[PDB]
Each structure stands twice: as C-alpha cells, then as structure tokens.
Coordinates of C-alpha atoms and ligand atoms in Angstrom, one line a residue:
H4 CA 86.3 104.6 115.1
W5 CA 85.7 101.1 116.4
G6 CA 85.0 100.4 120.1
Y7 CA 82.7 98.6 122.3
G8 CA 79.5 100.8 122.2
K9 CA 76.2 100.1 120.6
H10 CA 77.2 102.1 117.5
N11 CA 80.8 101.0 117.1
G12 CA 81.0 97.6 118.8
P13 CA 81.8 94.1 117.7
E14 CA 78.7 93.8 115.4
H15 CA 80.0 96.8 113.4
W16 CA 83.7 95.8 113.0
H17 CA 83.2 93.8 109.9
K18 CA 82.5 97.0 107.9
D19 CA 86.0 98.3 108.4
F20 CA 87.6 94.9 108.9
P21 CA 86.0 92.3 106.7
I22 CA 88.2 89.6 108.2
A23 CA 85.8 89.9 111.2
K24 CA 83.8 87.2 109.4
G25 CA 86.8 85.1 108.5
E26 CA 87.7 81.4 108.9
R27 CA 89.7 81.6 112.1
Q28 CA 88.3 84.4 114.3
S29 CA 88.7 84.6 118.1
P30 CA 87.5 84.3 120.8
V31 CA 85.6 81.1 120.7
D32 CA 83.6 79.0 123.1
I33 CA 85.6 76.1 124.4
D34 CA 83.4 73.1 124.6
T35 CA 85.3 71.0 127.1
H36 CA 83.6 67.7 126.1
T37 CA 84.5 68.2 122.3
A38 CA 88.1 69.4 122.9
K39 CA 90.5 66.5 122.4
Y40 CA 93.5 65.5 124.3
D41 CA 96.6 65.7 122.1
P42 CA 99.2 63.5 123.8
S43 CA 101.9 65.0 121.4
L44 CA 101.6 68.5 122.8
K45 CA 104.5 69.5 124.9
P46 CA 104.4 71.2 128.3
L47 CA 104.4 74.9 128.0
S48 CA 107.6 76.7 128.8
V49 CA 106.9 80.1 130.3
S50 CA 110.3 81.8 131.0
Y51 CA 109.6 85.1 132.6
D52 CA 112.5 85.4 135.1
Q53 CA 114.3 88.1 133.0
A54 CA 111.2 90.0 132.1
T55 CA 111.7 93.8 131.8
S56 CA 108.4 95.8 132.1
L57 CA 108.6 99.4 131.1
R58 CA 105.3 101.3 131.0
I59 CA 101.6 101.0 131.5
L60 CA 99.3 102.8 128.9
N61 CA 95.5 103.5 128.7
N62 CA 94.9 103.2 125.0
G63 CA 91.2 104.0 125.1
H64 CA 90.2 100.3 124.8
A65 CA 92.1 98.6 127.7
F66 CA 95.4 99.2 129.5
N67 CA 98.7 97.6 128.2
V68 CA 101.6 96.7 130.4
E69 CA 104.5 96.9 128.0
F70 CA 107.8 95.0 128.0
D71 CA 111.3 95.3 126.5
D72 CA 111.1 92.8 123.6
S73 CA 114.4 93.9 122.0
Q74 CA 116.0 90.7 123.4
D75 CA 114.9 87.2 124.5
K76 CA 114.0 88.2 128.1
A77 CA 110.5 86.9 128.7
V78 CA 109.6 84.1 126.3
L79 CA 107.0 81.5 125.6
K80 CA 108.0 78.2 124.0
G81 CA 106.9 74.6 123.8
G82 CA 103.3 73.5 123.9
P83 CA 101.9 73.7 120.4
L84 CA 104.6 76.2 119.4
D85 CA 107.7 75.9 117.3
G86 CA 110.4 78.5 118.0
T87 CA 110.5 81.3 120.5
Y88 CA 107.9 83.9 121.2
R89 CA 108.7 87.1 123.0
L90 CA 106.4 88.9 125.4
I91 CA 105.5 92.3 124.2
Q92 CA 102.6 93.3 126.4
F93 CA 99.8 92.1 128.5
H94 CA 96.3 93.5 129.0
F95 CA 92.9 92.4 130.2
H96 CA 89.2 92.4 129.0
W97 CA 86.6 92.7 131.7
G98 CA 82.9 93.3 132.4
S99 CA 80.6 95.7 134.1
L100 CA 79.3 92.8 136.2
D101 CA 81.1 89.8 137.6
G102 CA 79.1 87.5 135.4
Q103 CA 80.6 88.7 132.2
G104 CA 83.9 90.1 130.9
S105 CA 85.9 87.2 129.4
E106 CA 86.3 86.8 125.6
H107 CA 86.8 83.0 125.6
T108 CA 84.0 81.0 127.3
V109 CA 84.1 77.5 128.8
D110 CA 81.0 75.5 128.0
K111 CA 79.4 78.9 127.5
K112 CA 80.5 80.1 131.0
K113 CA 81.7 83.7 131.0
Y114 CA 84.4 84.7 133.5
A115 CA 84.7 88.2 135.1
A116 CA 87.8 89.0 133.1
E117 CA 90.5 87.6 130.9
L118 CA 94.2 88.3 130.8
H119 CA 96.1 88.2 127.5
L120 CA 99.9 87.9 127.5
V121 CA 100.9 88.7 124.0
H122 CA 104.0 87.2 122.4
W123 CA 105.5 87.4 118.9
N124 CA 107.5 84.8 116.9
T125 CA 111.1 85.9 116.8
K126 CA 111.7 84.4 113.4
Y127 CA 109.7 87.4 112.0
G128 CA 112.0 90.0 113.5
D129 CA 109.4 92.5 114.8
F130 CA 105.8 92.5 116.0
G131 CA 104.5 94.4 113.0
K132 CA 105.9 91.7 110.7
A133 CA 104.7 88.9 112.9
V134 CA 101.0 89.9 112.8
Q135 CA 101.1 89.4 109.0
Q136 CA 101.9 85.7 109.5
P137 CA 99.7 82.7 110.3
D138 CA 102.0 81.7 113.1
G139 CA 103.1 85.2 114.1
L140 CA 101.7 85.5 117.6
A141 CA 101.1 83.3 120.6
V142 CA 98.6 84.7 123.2
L143 CA 98.4 83.1 126.6
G144 CA 94.9 83.6 127.9
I145 CA 94.1 83.3 131.6
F146 CA 90.6 83.6 133.1
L147 CA 89.8 85.7 136.2
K148 CA 87.1 84.9 138.7
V149 CA 86.1 87.0 141.6
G150 CA 87.0 85.7 145.0
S151 CA 90.3 86.1 146.9
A152 CA 92.7 88.8 146.0
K153 CA 95.6 88.1 143.6
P154 CA 98.6 89.6 145.3
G155 CA 100.7 89.8 142.1
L156 CA 97.9 91.9 140.5
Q157 CA 97.9 94.6 143.1
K158 CA 100.7 96.7 141.8
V159 CA 98.8 97.0 138.5
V160 CA 95.6 97.9 140.3
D161 CA 97.3 100.7 142.3
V162 CA 98.7 102.5 139.3
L163 CA 95.4 102.7 137.5
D164 CA 94.4 106.0 139.0
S165 CA 97.4 107.5 137.3
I166 CA 96.2 106.3 133.8
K167 CA 92.5 107.0 134.2
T168 CA 91.9 108.3 130.7
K169 CA 92.8 107.5 127.1
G170 CA 96.4 108.4 126.1
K171 CA 97.8 108.5 129.7
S172 CA 100.8 106.4 130.5
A173 CA 103.0 105.8 133.6
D174 CA 106.4 104.2 134.3
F175 CA 105.9 100.6 135.2
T176 CA 109.3 99.0 135.7
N177 CA 110.2 95.9 137.7
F178 CA 106.8 94.2 137.4
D179 CA 107.0 90.4 137.5
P180 CA 104.3 88.8 135.4
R181 CA 104.9 85.5 137.0
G182 CA 102.6 86.7 139.8
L183 CA 99.6 86.6 137.5
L184 CA 99.9 82.9 136.6
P185 CA 97.8 80.1 138.2
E186 CA 99.4 77.0 139.6
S187 CA 98.7 74.7 136.7
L188 CA 99.8 75.3 133.1
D189 CA 97.2 72.8 131.7
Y190 CA 95.7 74.5 128.6
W191 CA 93.5 74.4 125.5
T192 CA 94.9 75.5 122.1
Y193 CA 93.5 76.4 118.7
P194 CA 94.4 78.7 115.7
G195 CA 92.7 82.1 115.8
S196 CA 93.0 85.8 115.6
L197 CA 93.4 89.1 117.3
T198 CA 90.2 89.8 119.2
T199 CA 90.3 93.5 118.4
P200 CA 90.7 95.3 115.1
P201 CA 92.7 94.6 112.9
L202 CA 91.4 91.1 113.7
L203 CA 94.4 89.5 111.9
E204 CA 94.5 85.7 111.8
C205 CA 97.9 85.4 113.2
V206 CA 97.4 83.9 116.7
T207 CA 98.1 80.5 118.2
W208 CA 95.8 80.7 121.2
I209 CA 96.9 79.0 124.5
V210 CA 94.1 79.3 127.1
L211 CA 94.8 78.1 130.6
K212 CA 92.3 75.8 132.2
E213 CA 92.8 77.1 135.7
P214 CA 91.5 80.6 136.4
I215 CA 93.1 83.0 138.8
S216 CA 91.1 84.6 141.6
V217 CA 91.0 88.4 142.0
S218 CA 89.1 90.3 144.7
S219 CA 85.9 92.3 144.1
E220 CA 88.0 95.4 145.1
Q221 CA 90.6 94.7 142.4
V222 CA 88.1 94.3 139.6
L223 CA 86.1 97.4 140.8
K224 CA 89.2 99.4 140.2
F225 CA 89.5 98.1 136.6
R226 CA 85.9 99.5 136.2
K227 CA 86.9 103.0 137.2
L228 CA 89.1 103.5 134.2
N229 CA 87.8 105.6 131.4
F230 CA 87.5 105.0 127.6
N231 CA 87.4 108.7 127.1
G232 CA 90.3 111.3 127.1
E233 CA 90.9 113.8 129.9
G234 CA 88.4 116.7 129.6
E235 CA 85.7 114.6 127.9
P236 CA 82.5 113.3 129.5
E237 CA 83.1 110.1 131.5
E238 CA 82.6 106.8 129.8
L239 CA 83.6 104.0 132.1
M240 CA 85.9 101.4 130.7
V241 CA 83.8 98.3 131.1
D242 CA 82.6 95.5 128.8
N243 CA 85.7 95.7 126.5
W244 CA 85.3 92.1 125.3
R245 CA 84.4 90.6 121.9
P246 CA 81.9 87.7 122.2
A247 CA 82.5 84.2 121.0
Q248 CA 82.9 83.7 117.2
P249 CA 82.0 80.6 115.1
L250 CA 84.5 77.8 115.5
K251 CA 84.1 76.8 111.8
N252 CA 86.7 74.4 110.6
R253 CA 88.8 74.1 113.7
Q254 CA 89.5 71.7 116.5
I255 CA 90.4 72.8 120.0
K256 CA 93.2 70.6 121.5
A257 CA 93.7 69.9 125.2
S258 CA 97.1 69.4 126.9
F259 CA 95.5 67.3 129.6
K260 CA 93.1 64.5 130.2
Ligands
IE2_301 C1 93.5 99.4 120.6 C2 94.4 98.3 120.0 C3 94.8 97.2 120.6 C4 95.6 96.2 120.0 C5 96.0 96.4 118.6 C6 95.5 97.6 118.1 N1 94.8 98.6 118.7 S1 95.9 98.1 116.4 C7 97.5 97.2 116.1 C8 97.6 95.9 116.8 C9 98.2 94.7 116.4 N2 97.9 93.7 117.3 N3 97.1 94.2 118.1 C10 96.6 93.3 119.1 C11 95.2 93.3 119.0 C12 94.6 92.3 119.8 C13 95.2 91.4 120.7 S2 94.4 90.2 121.7 N4 93.1 90.9 122.4 O1 95.3 89.7 122.6 O2 94.0 89.3 120.6 C14 96.7 91.4 120.8 C15 97.3 92.4 120.0 C16 96.9 95.5 117.9
ZN302 ZN1 93.1 90.8 124.4

C-alpha cells in the first residue's frame, strides 16, 4: 500500500494512481514573483463560529480532526469560490526536522509543517461525490513555522498520546478551528489535486501567505505519533508530505499586492 517510505512513497504512487502525473497535481512551488494579483478575487469568508468537531483519528498517514458536515456549520465561501464549501476535516503534514515538512513551498522555501482544512462543495451533496468534480473541494492551506507556541493548537497536541498508532481514535468535541488561523487571510490560489492518493484533480487550493508559529515542543509531539498499528514495530510518523509537482499549464493568483 502507498505511504511515505522509500519503497512506497511519492515516486511510486503513479503505478497505482496514474493521475499522479496529471495536468493539475498538487502541491506546487509558489513563485511569489510570478504569481499575479487578481483584483477581481473576493476576500475569503471563513465562517467557523458554529463548527462542530467530533473525533480525532490516526489513519496511518496523518491525524484527522473530523467535523459534523451534515449541515452548514463551518463553511468557506468567497475568494475564488462560487458557492458554499463545508468543512469536513483538517489534518497536517510535517517533517522529521524543522527545515522540511510542508507540501507547498514558497520560492522553494519549505516550512516545518502545513495545515489543510478540507471543505467540499455543497452542490454535490456529499464528499464522495464532490471529489469526482473539478470544483468539488476547497482546501485552505496554512504554513507552520517553529517559534512561539500556538495556543489554539495545544488541545490537539495533548490528545495525540491517545491516538499514537494507526486506527486509534478519540472523542474530540468542542474544538474551535478559528484558533489555528493567522491574522491575515491574504492568499494564493490555483487549481490542483488531493496531495495523497487517490490524487484526484478536484481541489481549488487556497494557501495563506502568513504562516502560524508553533513551538518546538508542539511539533516534537507530532513526531511521536506512529504510522504503524499497535503491536507493530515503531515507525515514527514524520515526513508525511508530497514534494512540489510541476505547475504545467497553470497560473497562481494572489489576493494581495
Ligand atoms: C489516508 C487517506 C487520506 C485522505 C484520503 C484518503 N486516504 S482515500 C479517500 C480520500 C478522498 N480525499 N482524500 C483526501 C486526500 C487528500 C487531501 S489533501 N492532503 O488536503 O489534499 C484531502 C482529502 C482522501
Ligand atoms: Zn493534506
């Protein structure tokens, strides 16, 4: 099965998922000088006040914080989007070292980690249908750098010991994802894909310019998670990121000058 090791990592994925070599794969390098301001883009609308978190799950690749997406409770709208996209889950990608971990890069700079808030277009009725459409998902990407702690991240960090291994989950209600956002909602946007198998080309990427800062202790706790199941030899969950893919026939747009 696919993963992030030498024998099953990103360079192997194309054998089971040929779209890995497609026309709109993610992540990409964001060349800041080549991205163009699009004055027609609208401010993002991030409406998370009624968000209902449910559960946190170690799925063997990352951990997902899952939300109730059976009503319009936490939605993303505006920006490059038409219509309403519901938050289904968030998760992170991160490195074994502070100098790597992000999936998108900025002028080839790698951040320590990257948060993905995953939303699906309500016109398609459910997430499974949405991923089959070119405008099915909107993923809000936020970079993490190591410095001061992020207070809004700590509740996530503290539950990780309870989901150390693949397949473990824990109740995770009443978590407010607003605490993971930076001050500014300035962003870059481009059409892309899921960054793990099945690599479907269904995502409008919205990547925030401003990173959030997390502490060395916070990211160290991410790196104590395991890819393996309980009762299996330990494989630390680190370096669960796909590298930058070719931009091909795409233009990255900026919401800001
Ligand atoms: C282990 C694992 C994780 C995720 C998925 C799957 N398996 S298989 C079914 C499915 C459908 N979408 N999707 C998803 C994949 C990637 C991103 S990201 N990283 O935000 O582009 C968001 C959602 C997954
Ligand atoms: Zn992701």
